[PDB]
Copies of this chain bind each other. A is one copy, B any other.
Amino acid sequence: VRRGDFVRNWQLVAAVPLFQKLGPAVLVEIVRALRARTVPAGAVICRIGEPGDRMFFVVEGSVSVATPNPVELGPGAFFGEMALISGEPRSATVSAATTVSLLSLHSADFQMLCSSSPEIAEIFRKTALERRG
Contacts and interface: CB of A to CB of B under 8 A. Distances in A.
Among A3, A14, A20, residue most surrounded by chain B Cβ atoms (within 10 Å): A3
Nearest to A19: B7
Copies in the complex: 2
Say what secondary structure dominates the interface of chain A.
helix
Interface stretch (A23-31, A42-50, A100-108): A23-31
A3 B7 CA distance: 17
A11 interface: yes
A7 B32 contact: no
A27 B7 contact: yes
Interface of A: 1, 3, 6-7, 10-11, 14, 20, 22-24, 27-28, 32
